[PDB]
C-alpha cells in the first residue's frame, strides 16, 4: 500500500544479496549455455528481467529444465554483460561491446536495455 513505510534501499539490497548467492552458486537452478560458455543463474531473476526467459520458464512444458541452450549466434560477452545487469542494475556499455550487447538484449526481450542502447549509439 502507498500508506506503508517505504525502505528505499530494500530492493537494491535484495538484489545485491541475490548476486552474492549467484557468486556462491547457492540455489542456482539453471545453466545458460552460450556457444562454448556456461552461466549459472536463478530462473526467477531471469524471468523477472527478460521476456525470453519469462516465456520459456512460465510454460509448464519447459519450466523444469535445468539447461537452456541459447541461439549459438549470441555473443557470450554480450550475454554476460546483460546477466550482470540483471543482478546489479548496472549496464556496461562500451564502444567495443555496444553492438553485441544491443543485439543480445533484443534477443532476450529486454526493451528498457534496448532503448538505452539506442541512446548510447545516439550519444556517441
Ligand atoms: C508490453 N509488453 C511487451 C513485452 N514485454 C516482454 C517482457 C519484458 N520483460 C522485461 C521487462 O519488461 N522489464 C521491465 C522491468 O524491469 C525488469 C525487466 C519482461 C519480463 C517478464 N517477467 C515477468 S515476471 N512479467 C510479469 C508480468 C507480465 C508481463 N507479461 C506477462 C504476460 C502474462 C502474464 C504476466 C506478464 C515478462 C515479460 C517481459 C513485456 C511488456
UniProtKB/Swiss-Prot annotation:
Reported tissue expression: Expressed in germinal center T- and B-cells and in primary immature dendritic cells.
Biological role: Transcriptional repressor mainly required for germinal center (GC) formation and antibody affinity maturation which has different mechanisms of action specific to the lineage and biological functions. Forms complexes with different corepressors and histone deacetylases to repress the transcriptional expression of different subsets of target genes. Represses its target genes by binding directly to the DNA sequence 5'-TTCCTAGAA-3' (BCL6-binding site) or indirectly by repressing the transcriptional activity of transcription factors.
Protein name: B-cell lymphoma 6 protein
Subcellular location: Nucleus
PTM per Swiss-Prot/TrEMBL: Phosphorylated by ATM in response to genotoxic stress. Phosphorylation induces its degradation by ubiquitin/proteasome pathway.
Domain topic, free-text comment: The BTB domain mediates homodimerization. Its dimer interface mediates peptide binding such as to corepressors BCOR and NCOR2. Interaction with corepressors through the BTB domain is needed to facilitate the rapid proliferation and survival of GC B-cells but is not involved in the T(FH) formation and BCL6-mediated suppression of T(H)2 and T(H)17 differentiationrequired for GC formation.
Summary of subunit composition and partner proteins: Homodimer. Interacts (via BTB domain) with the corepressors BCOR, NCOR1 and SMRT/NCOR2; the interactions are direct. Forms preferably ternary complexes with BCOR and SMRT/NCOR2 on target gene promoters but, on enhancer elements, interacts with SMRT/NCOR2 and HDAC3 to repress proximal gene expression. Interacts with histone deacetylases HDAC2, HDAC5 and HDAC9 (via the catalytic domain). Interacts with ZBTB7 and BCL6B. Interacts with SCF(FBXO11) complex; the interaction is independent of phosphorylation and promotes ubiquitination.
Induction or repression: Down-regulated during maturation of dendritic cells by selective stimuli such as bacterial lipopolysaccharides (LPS), CD40LG and zymosan. Protein levels decreases upon genotoxic stress in a dose- and time-dependent way.
Disease: Chromosomal aberrations involving BCL6 are a cause of B-cell non-Hodgkin lymphomas (B-cell NHL), including diffuse large B-cell lymphoma and follicular lymphoma. Approximately 40% of diffuse large B-cell lymphomas and 5 to 10% of follicular lymphomas are associated with chromosomal translocations that deregulate expression of BCL6 by juxtaposing heterologous promoters to the BCL6 coding domain. Translocation t(3;14)(q27;q32). Translocation t(3;22)(q27;q11) with immunoglobulin gene regions. Translocation t(3;7)(q27;p12) with IKZF1 gene 5'non-coding region.
Domain BTB: residue ranges: 28-95
